[PDB]
Amino acid sequence: GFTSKDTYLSHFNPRDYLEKYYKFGSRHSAESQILKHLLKNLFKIFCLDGVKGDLLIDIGSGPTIYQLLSACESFKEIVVTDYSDQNLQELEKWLKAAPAAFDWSPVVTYVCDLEGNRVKGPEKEEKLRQAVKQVLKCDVTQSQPLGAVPLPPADCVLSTLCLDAACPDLPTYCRALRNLGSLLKPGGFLVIMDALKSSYYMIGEQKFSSLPLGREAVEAAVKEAGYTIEWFEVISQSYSSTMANNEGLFSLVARKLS
Numbered sequence: 001g002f003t004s005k006d007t008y009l010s011h012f013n014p015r016d017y018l019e020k021y022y023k024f025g026s027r028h029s030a031e032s033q034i035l036k037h038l039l040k041n042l043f044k045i046f047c048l049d050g051v052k053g054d055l056l057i058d059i060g061s062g063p064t065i066y067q068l069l070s071a072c073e074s075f076k077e078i079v080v081t082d083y084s085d086q087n088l089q090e091l092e093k094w095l096k097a098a099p100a101a102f103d104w105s106p107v108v109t110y111v112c113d114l115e116g117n118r119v120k121g122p123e124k125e126e127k128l129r130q131a132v133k134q135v136l137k138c139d140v141t142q143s144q145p146l147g148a149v150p151l152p153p154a155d156c157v158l159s160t161l162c163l164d165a166a167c168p169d170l171p172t173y174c175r176a177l178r179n180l181g182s183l184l185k186p187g188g189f190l191v192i193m194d195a196l197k198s199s200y201y202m203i204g205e206q207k208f209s210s211l212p213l214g215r216e217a218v219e220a221a222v223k224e225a226g227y228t229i230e231w232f233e234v235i236s237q238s239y240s241s242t243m244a245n246n247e248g249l250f251s252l253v254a255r256k257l258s
């Protein structure tokens with residue numbers, strides 16, 4: 001069996017998720033080490049590499065913004081999407097600078113440092129808030145992930161830690177890659193970062209399924225789905241034993257063949 005989609009609407013607590021994985025505490029936890037590596041990869045893709053354009057769609061954003069910090073320097077507009085309405089509400093609390101919003105300042109500061117300290121935290125945060133115009137529902141398992149909502153074909157589709165959680169099997173994972181491709185313009189970029197060989201992840205006592213994929217199956221599915229791989233990186237760093245049973249993480253950049 002595998003976690004049903006509806007479980008994300010009801011049982012995925014966005015504040016608990018942020019507390020458990022993104023607090024970015026002084027302790028050199030496995031979670032903070034992964035967060036740092038993700039940030040470095042995202043900086044390399046968006047600011048160092050030529051990954052830019054008018055529109056980036058972030059798929060399965062959850063309640064997080066860390067994956068958009070470097071992207072807001074390179075894209076006029078960023079659209080954040082998720083299957084969960086609760087997650088999108090928590091994201092909107094940060095976007096609207098509400099009092100109950102999650103404290104992203106340690107991560108924001110870290111991203112500013114990476115980029116050369118050209119700007120400081122508040123200026124960086126304001127650039128992200130200005131870039132995010134739409135907060136949409138999405139279902140990666142559907143041929144139209146965004147439903148009846150129309151969007152121009154995007155220059156880039158980004159998905160961090162979403163596809164392993166949303167796809168119950170390898171054929172569904174390959175179809176989800178094809179479905180994301182429907183949102184991309186020909187030659188547009190696909191950026192995926194996710195756990196390798198992970199069959200579950202936890203949010204406190206709440207268990208969530210994950211599709212356990214190795215690097216070869218991820219690369220094969222991306223090629224089967226109609227992309228060409230630009231680069232593929234595997235990091236050996238895994239989450240704490242209490243959080244997930246992954247054997248590292250991967251990051252890839254691919255281009256949609258027309």
Ligand SMILES: Nc1ncnc2c1ncn2[C@@H]1O[C@H](CSCC[C@H](N)C(=O)O)[C@@H](O)[C@H]1O
Pocket residue numbers: 005008012059060061062063064067082083084087138139140141159160161162163165166
């Ligand atoms: N079918 C589906 N379509 C879209 N999003 C889905 C989905 N099934 C699960 N999700 C979402 O996938 C996310 C996994 S958590 C990942 C959040 C964030 N991108 C990060 O990097 O931390 C959750 O927000 C969940 O709601």
Ligand SMILES: COc1ccc(C(N)=O)c[n+]1C
Pocket residue numbers: 021161162164165195198199200201210211239244245246
């Ligand atoms: C931190 O969020 C994580 C961590 C690990 C996994 C997994 N697929 O093992 C999934 N998520 C969403």
